[PDB]
Design a protein around this ligand. Structure first.
Ligand SMILES: Nc1ncnc2c1ncn2[C@@H]1O[C@H](COP(=O)(O)OP(=O)(O)O)[C@@H](O)[C@H]1O
Ligand SMILES: [Cl-]
Ligand SMILES: [K+]
Length: 380
């Protein structure tokens, strides 16, 4: 009787939807946000999840955990883990070749498996859904990247079970986005679909063939370390330089000032997707000095031009691997918040010689939307 939910357990943001009464609704959290940071923070007094966790990241970098999706289902000695560890402010330890994130909580050293951290994010998403529906939720579909292996899939399912969910199915992110657009509904005959997923930390291109509702992954490409965070970073460096020029002071070694500037850059970037200019207004950025400035859409595009253009070669690669021409792609689907950037849409559309882009569902919601459809299907 309770509706089942669909959860996009994102690298940087998660999203939850529900299909009922003939339609999907993506559910807003307590702050009114339709996506929620995949962040968990531990303090002297509480555990914070989502917006509350991300909103104190500058204050508490050692104990604010993110990127758990990069660890989940991996062994400590996995080269990906050993590489990624070098760039996180939190500690990762080895418990019998399994990674654990080590933090301080309520004055004590504690360590958590990645699936435990992800379970906390999942608990938040479940609670968001429950506040909207007015009752406890017990069934969910959760999504994962197409490239996830059996261990990563099981660890993700385990995160759900820890969160108190019966996991109806673990399905691929690109498949979920296809389902969102009802591309699973055609009968006999192949339909080739390209999913272009540029999120906060990763870029995934998937080519799917759908034939009578059956999905085959034909090709995957991309970069697991290219996303919106890199665009924020280009803005950060730009403004660090601007602050140096205006005040003859370098803020780069002040972790707090840099992180606060980063937050302000992410906000301005979002504004630039719908406006041609954005203002930044940081109070007491550095040594009580305020930073009140502006950024145009064109300047932002300039600062990121190589990164935006770099998304096209993985499309070329995926097409080659799938042995398909551009014209053989029936549908182009935008996934990931970064695909809201007008210049990114232009690049992809131009590459496809003027083709329609499927973008009527907010790209940062498409995966949750499809997961919610599938959850309702599996419930019957
Ligand atoms: N309107 C927007 N314009 C540009 N970038 C956006 C916009 N909305 C969200 N983003 C970016 O999307 C990225 C997050 O992508 P999302 O699809 O929510 O999940 P994930 O990062 O988990 O793949 C972040 O870099 C965020 O700043
Ligand atoms: Cl262009
Ligand atoms: K996401």
């Amino acid at each position: 009787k309770a509706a089942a939910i669909g959860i996009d357990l994102g690298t940087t943001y998660s999203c939850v939807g529900v299909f009922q009464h003939g339609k999907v609704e993506i559910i807003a959290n307590d702050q009114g946000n339709r996506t929620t940071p995949s962040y968990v923070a531990f303090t002297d007094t509480e555990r914070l999840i989502g917006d509350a966790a991300k909103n104190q990241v500058a204050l508490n970098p050692q104990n604010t955990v993110f990127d758990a999706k990069r660890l989940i289902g991996r062994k400590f000695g996995d080269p990906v883990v050993q590489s990624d560890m070098k760039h996180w402010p939190f500690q990762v330890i080895n418990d019998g070749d399994k990674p654990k994130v080590q933090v301080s909580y309520k004055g004590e050293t504690k360590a958590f498996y990645p699936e435990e951290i992800s379970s906390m994010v999942l608990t938040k998403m479940k609670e968001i859904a429950e506040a909207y529906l007015g009752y406890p939720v017990t069934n969910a579909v959760i999504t994962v990247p197409a490239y996830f292996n059996d261990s990563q899939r099981q660890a993700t399912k385990d995160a759900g079970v820890i969160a108190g969910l019966n996991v109806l199915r673990i399905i691929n992110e690109p498949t979920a986005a296809a389902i969102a657009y009802g591309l699973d509904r055609t009968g006999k005959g192949e339909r080739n679909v390209l999913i272009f997923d540029l999120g906060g930390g990763t870029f995934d291109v998937s080519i799917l063939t759908i034939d009578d509702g059956i999905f085959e992954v034909k090709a995957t490409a991309g970069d697991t370390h290219l996303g919106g965070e890199d665009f924020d970073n280009r803005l950060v460096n730009h403004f660090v330089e601007e602050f140096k020029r205006k005040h003859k002071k370098d803020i780069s070694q002040n972790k707090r000032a840099v992180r606060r500037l980063r937050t302000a850059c992410e906000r301005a970037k979002r504004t630039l997707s719908s406006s041609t200019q954005a203002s930044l207004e940081i109070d007491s950025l550095f040594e009580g000095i305020d930073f009140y400035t502006s950024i145009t859409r064109a300047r932002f595009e300039e600062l990121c031009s190589d990164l935006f253009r770099s998304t096209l070669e993985p499309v070329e690669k995926a097409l080659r691997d799938a042995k398909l021409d551009k014209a053989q792609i029936h549908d182009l689907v935008l996934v990931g918040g970064s695909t809201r950037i007008p210049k990114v849409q232009k690049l992809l559309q131009d590459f496809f010689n003027g083709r329609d882009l499927n973008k009527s569902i907010n790209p940062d919601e498409a995966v949750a939307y499809g997961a919610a459809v599938q959850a309702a299907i599996l419930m019957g």
